């Protein structure tokens, strides 16, 4: 397997990456955590970024997540 | 394995994602389904979007699919 | 596993996709084959496209391939 | 498995690709090595490139790496 998804880069340089530890990480370009988002399963899918900055990623809990840029859930799709 | 491919984002913000349930999903940015497209196998490949909006994704049924933005098959390649 | 890599789209709309059948495929947007390129192993890696149109993809024969837009080998890196 | 991640392309055409041999490779468009970066595990994740050229990739040593364009470590995140 792979511990990390491929990263995605936001407008301000934020680095978003999924982990098989079940979290989506948002990392500042300075290497400090901005936030992390808890899903119910491994995040192998590489995040995509919408035109408005929404971060989308699938989880092995079977949901497609839409996360606001501040780390709060926008919605999940099953 | 992974339940989801990595998502792709269309011009209008539509989120396209493959599933190992054999479907390609097109999701409105509001979290409601736009359409889903039935293939014959797991869609692990992450979709790509052409300049005219066509959505391309491979399936483990061994076909490369070209899907119109309205969810109708354009062609499949083997 | 997955039969297909994720596709990449060229300037003219050409769709490039790797297969576990060991080939990199270049498909016209009309669904007809432009060319295919034979490697020595499964092409699980998703191709990337350079600014000059070169197509790059890794193969499980352990080479990173650079392919010209006309399907001829440019170089391979090990 | 897959020996290579999907490649990423830098501003000057440099091709960045991870290997399950634990290294991230930066290859000149002419096919000669620019540098390689040693991690502690397979680099299955496909690199992403920041707006300032930083290369980000995850490794199965459980770190997300930020690498400067000259191949020197910028930081690693766990």
- Pick D4's closest partner by Cβ from C45, C50, C51: C45
Q: How far apart are CA C53 and CA C50, in angstroms?
A: 5
Neighbours of A13 (CB within 10 A): 15
Q: Are D27 and D15 in contact (CB under 8 A)?
A: yes
Q: Is B3 on the interface with A (CB under 8 A)?
A: yes
Q: How was this structure determined?
A: X-ray
| Three-state DSSP state, C34 | strand
Strands B23-27 and D73-77: unpaired
Between CA C55 and CA C5 the distance in angstroms is 14
Smallest CA-to-CA distance from C69 within C5, C30, C26 is with C26
CB atoms within 10 A of CB C35: 16
Question: What are the beta bridge partners of residue B25?
Answer: B17, B36
Q: Assess A5–B contact: CB distance below 8 Å, yes or no.
A: yes
Residue B4 labelled as part of a binding site: no
Q: Do B7 and A44 touch (CB under 8 A)?
A: no
Question: Could you tell me how far CA A23 lies from the centroid of its own chain?
Answer: 7
Polymer length in residues for chain D: 78
Asked whether the beta carbons of residue B17 and residue A49 sit closer than 8 angstroms, the reply is no
Cα dihedral angle (B69, B74, C1, C4), rounded to 10 degrees?
-100
Cα A56 from Cα A33, distance rounded (Å): 18
Measure the CA–CA gap between C10 and D68, rounded to whole angstroms. 28
SS3 A17: strand
Assess B40–A contact: CB distance below 8 Å, yes or no.
no
Question: How far apart are the C-alpha atoms of B3 and B43, rounded to whole Å?
Answer: 9
What DSSP designation does A5 have? -
Residue B22 in marked binding region: yes
Q: Which helix (H) or strand (E) holds A75?
A: strand A73-77
Check whether domain D8-77 has CATH 3.40.50.2300, yes or no: no
Q: How far is B16 from chain A (nearest CA, A)?
A: 10
The span from the CA of A76 to the CA of A65, in Å, is 4
Is residue D49 within 8 Å of D26, Cβ to Cβ? no
What residues does each domain of chain C span? 8-77
Q: Residue B55 in contact with residue B43, Cβ under 8 Å?
A: no
Strands (E) across chain D are located at 8-9, 15-18, 23-27, 33-38, 48-49, 55-58, 64-67, 73-77
Question: Which residue matches tokens 């999701």?
Answer: B27
DSSP single-letter state for residue D72 = -
Residue C68 burial (C-beta neighbours within 10 Å; 0-12, 13-18, 19+): middle
Are the CB atoms for A56 and A50 separated by under 8 Å? Answer: yes
- In 3-state terms, chain D is what percent helix, strand and coil (to 5)? 0, 45, 55
- In angstroms, rounded to a whole number, what is the distance separating the alpha carbons of residues B4 and A62? 8
Residues of chain B contacting residue A59, judged by C-beta atoms under 8 Å apart: 3-4
The residue among D6, D23, D33 with the most chain C CBs within 10 A of its CB, best to mutate, is: D6
D-chain CB neighbours of C64 within 8 Å are 4, 7, 15, 17, 25, 27
Compute the C-alpha angle B34/B36/B37, nearest 5°. Answer: 140
Instruction: Say which DSSP state B63 is in.
Output: P
- The residues that bridge with C26 in the sheet, in sequence order, are C16, C35
**Chain C residue with the nearest C-alpha to that of B5:** C6
Distance CA B55, CA B78 (A): 16
D25 pairs with which residues across the strands?
Answer: D17, D36
Q: Do A46 and B6 touch (CB under 8 A)?
A: yes
- Name the residue in chain C with its Cα closest to that of B56: C7
Whole-angstrom Cα distance, residue C20 to residue A15? 30
Q: What is the largest CA-CA distance in chain B?
A: 35
Smallest CA–CA separation between D49 and chain C, in Å? 13
Residues 45-64 of C with CB under 8 A from B: 46
User: How far does C57 lie from chain D, in Å, by closest CA?
Assistant: 7
Distance in angstroms (rounded) separating the CA atoms of residues B62 and C41: 17
Degrees to nearest 5, angle at CA B28 with B27 and B34: 60
C-alpha span between A12 and D1 (Å, rounded): 34
Among D45, D65, D40, D42, CA closest to D54? D65
DSSP-derived 3-state class of residue B68: coil
How far apart (Å, rounded) are the C-alpha atoms in residues D9 and D13?
Answer: 6
Alpha carbon distance D13, D27 (integer Å):
9
The full 3-state SS of A22-71, as one line of letters, equals CEEEEECCCCCEEEEEECCCCCCCCCEECCCCCEEEECCCCCEEEECCCC
| Edge-first strand listing for the sheet containing B48-49 | B48-49, B55-58, B64-67, B73-77
Distance, CA of D30 to CA of D8 (rounded, Å): 16
Tokens of C19: 């297969």
């Amino acid at each position: 397997g792979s511990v990390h998804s491929s990263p995605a880069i936001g407008q301000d340089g934020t680095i978003y990456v999924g982990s098989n530890d079940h979290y989506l990480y948002a990392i500042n370009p300075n290497g400090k955590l901005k936030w992390k988002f808890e899903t119910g399963g491994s995040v192998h899918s590489s995040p995509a970024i919408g035109q408005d900055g929404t971060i989308y990623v699938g989880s092995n809990d079977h949901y497609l997540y839409a996360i606001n840029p501040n780390g709060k859930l926008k919605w999940k799709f099953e």
